[PDB]
A paper describes a structure:
We solved the crystal structure of CrRPI1 in the P21 space group at 1.40 Å resolution. Each monomer is composed of six alpha helices and twelve beta strands distributed into two domains. The first domain contains the catalytic pocket, while the second was proposed to play a role in the oligomerization of RPIA. CrRPI1 is a homodimer in solution and in the crystal packing. The homodimeric state is also observed in the crystal asymmetric unit with α helices h4, h5 and h6 and β strands s10 contributing to the interface. CrRPI1 catalytic site is described free from substrate and product, representing the apo state of the enzyme. Six water molecules, a sulfate ion and a sodium ion are however present and therefore allow to predict the coordination and placement of its substrate R5P in this pocket through structural superposition and sequence analysis. The sulfate ion in CrRPI1 hence occupies the location of the phosphate of the ribose-5-phosphate supporting a conserved mode of substrate recognition. This sulfate ion is coordinated by polar contacts with the side chains of S60, T61, and K155 and the main chain amine of T61. In our CrRPI1 crystal structure, C149 and C250 position their sulfur atoms 4.4 Å apart, a distance compatible with the formation of a disulfide bridge.
Numbering used by the authors:
A (entry chain B): 29 to 266
B (entry chain A): 29 to 264
The structure:
């Protein structure tokens, strides 16, 4: 009630930075919640409370932010194994399966976080969903440019996502393009995806798809900030 | 004996074009074998032997070839259902599972041929293998450019292929770029892949991978030209 969404995001972020220890290679997430964690890491480095940190950014925005804070930076090519990654999420379900990449940086986030021994996800409690898709907001699929209308229709008609709407993401007059020159088809649900693993496999199995925003069996710890306080949720059913 | 590899390829190609009937939407393959079939379709149209054909090219190269022949063209966006697709293969195993993409066009070939009611594969008999990977030549994987060095190492270490060699495909001193602006990592095996379906799943499951050259449960008919003559094998 008194705590704004931004204040909750920052509370979750600071709790997550407690998983960062001196000497670690850290995956630096993207978006407004992650930006609070990047700033906290930068602050702690400046204060000498952390030392010998290398960050791997997941977006141009994060690269620029971390560079401005003086955080040493590397790429996955240079540091292919990360100790901890901290990132936000667009949706979090009761399994700690998440939708990510809605705002961009989908594949980079996925590749960095798959390379991380511990993935700490930070959210305010508005990101909790009954099931993936349940926010009714975009669930992104990265696709090749060739025959993108065909692929969009193919996606919308996959049994595993039956009932969704699908829209090619536009950047004004031109289709939006990812870091890898691919297009995005956003899927929109009115009820959650029933079997997220089956949906992930079916979408990846579609020739023409590069990747998608279902980040399954990846998050190890979710930090959830809400009006009542901050909850640290280890992944259920280990 | 007297027949050269190119002559065998053309024999297979001409036999495959017999599956093309007036009225059809036809997937047009890529590579030297398929090019003979594209040229034959174009000839038959010019001669009036075929009518009402639309072609759907699997590469920029084949688009250009069909353009030069006057074959009406479309894409899956306009013709999502094809009647017949004719294409080559790098390896053909006993069940008509194949490896493709040595020419770079695996992705669009896969999309086009997956949309085709009948996929006719044309080869000379040097392409037949007992098991996929068994040619000891490239099993291609199309990957995104971002951190491709990283992706190549992850690819090489997947349980399903671990043991192979993995090489970023080069065009001289620069990496090869596909029609989709991606790179290719070619995997090289000394013995056939243990489980091609499992290898397909694992490779597709690797974030950074676009698609790969294992074309499983796709070919319906394989036309094989060898010194003895032309053989027609339907899917077991
Ligand atoms: Na017609
Ligand atoms: Na090819």
């Amino acid at each position: 009630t008194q705590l704004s969404q931004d204040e909750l995001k920052k509370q979750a972020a600071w709790k997550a930075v407690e998983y960062v220890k001196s000497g670690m290679v850290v995956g630096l997430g993207t978006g407004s919640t992650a930006a609070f964690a990047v700033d906290r890491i930068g602050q702690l480095l400046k204060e000498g409370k952390l030392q010998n940190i290398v960050g791997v950014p997941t977006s141009i925005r994060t690269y620029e932010q971390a560079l401005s804070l003086g955080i040493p930076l590397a790429t996955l090519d240079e540091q292919p194994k990360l100790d901890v990654a901290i990132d936000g999420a667009d949706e979090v379900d009761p399994n700690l399966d998440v939708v990510k990449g809605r705002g961009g940086a989908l594949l980079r986030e996925k590749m960095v976080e798959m390379a991380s021994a511990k993935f700490v996800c930070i959210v305010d409690d508005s990101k909790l969903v009954e099931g993936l898709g349940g926010s009714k907001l975009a669930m992104p699929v990265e696709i090749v440019q060739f025959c993108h209308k065909y692929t969009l229709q193919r996606l919308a008609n996959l049994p595993e996502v039956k009932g969704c709407e699908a829209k090619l993401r536009m950047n004004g007059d031109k289709p939006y393009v990812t870091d890898n020159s691919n297009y995005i088809v956003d899927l929109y649900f009115q009820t959650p995806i029933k079997d997220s693993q089956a949906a992930s496999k079916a979408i990846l199995g579609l020739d023409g798809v590069v990747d998608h925003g279902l980040f399954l069996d990846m998050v190890d710890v979710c930090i959830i900030a809400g009006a009542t306080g901050v909850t640290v949720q280890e992944r259920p059913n280990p």
